[PDB]
Symmetry: C2
Subunit: 193 residues, 2 copies
């Protein structure tokens, strides 16, 4: 005669449609935790962003933060900071993510790694200072970490003879803006001459 | 002295940001395949859509298809069908997904299951007929399958005595519109009187 349908829950796919990017993005990570092997699989079918895309990212982030200050209050008071700590931290995390990507073990492309650090530093110059000294440790800590960053790259051009033309001028403008908390790299850079 | 950073690939999360909804949705499914156990986990933290949300879904689908016909051609010719087969099939799949959800094993809520079938049928009345008979097997096949659907529900009110008030009139308008290819349910429905 005839087959009569048997009810059942709806299919996983149909159920995920009612899940948004953050929702899938979020519930996808939990999967990696349960079955860590997923890391390899995902990394392979998903190509990394272009040096430009990454750079473009930070810009939006900091531009995002720059427009987030109070409607018209002292952008250096604590209050102004309270509203920005969030988009502030966003720009920093992204800084901590992308930088190791262009450093010595993982990236041997000297001329390609320095180029990036240049852009990253410029992003840090743009960070916002505050009246409270407690809110400026982030910008200081940045300058420190980056000085350590350029130092790692510069070292990848040590023994390999012939010392190509180095960004002697770049570090100058960088350190100038950074009020000298990048001297360790500048000397090392010049010392490579 | 000082720790010098060690480069590395960027973190999975940072890499997924450059992945869109379809991209995550798509690469998430592949995960379930490799580790089927994920099905249970996901189903639990993700609540199903409200009877209304599902209904709302189909509407958009068919409205989507209704606006997709050629710029001004015979919406019954083959050409017109070629452009719609896609959004056509979309409305059908969704029909095949959501219906089993409201049937006898999975759903015992008689008054809640029929209510849904009502809306689903109405969605099928709205389907587009064509000059070619080959393109109308989908609408026929629908009417058939749904007749089988109401039949399953109606059976869940069989032995359980007291035969509550049944949608005797609803099936009438339904079958009327469907040009009688739903008689098996209509009789059975009336036979339940």
């Amino acid at each position: 005669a005839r087959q009569l349908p048997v009810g059942e829950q709806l299919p996983l796919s149909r159920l995920l449609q009612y899940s948004d990017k953050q929702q899938l993005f979020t519930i996808l990570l939990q999967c990696v935790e349960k079955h860590p092997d997923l890391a390899r699989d995902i990394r392979g079918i998903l190509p990394a962003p272009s040096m430009d895309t990454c750079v473009e990212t930070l810009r939006k982030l900091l531009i995002n933060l720059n427009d987030s200050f109070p409607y018209g209050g002292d952008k250096r008071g604590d209050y102004a900071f309270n509203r920005i700590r969030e988009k502030y931290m966003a720009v920093l995390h992204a800084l901590n993510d992308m930088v190791p990507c262009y450093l010595p073990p993982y990236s041997t492309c000297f001329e390609k790694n320095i180029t990036f650090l240049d852009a990253a530093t410029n992003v840090v110059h743009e960070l916002p200072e505050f009246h409270n000294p407690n809110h400026n440790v982030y910008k200081s800590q940045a300058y420190y970490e980056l000085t350590g960053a350029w130092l790692v790259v510069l070292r990848q051009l040590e023994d390999r003879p012939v010392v190509p033309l180095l960004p002697l001028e770049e570090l100058e403008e960088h350190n100038k803006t950074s009020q000298n908390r990048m001297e360790e790299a500048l000397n090392y850079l010049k010392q490579l001459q």
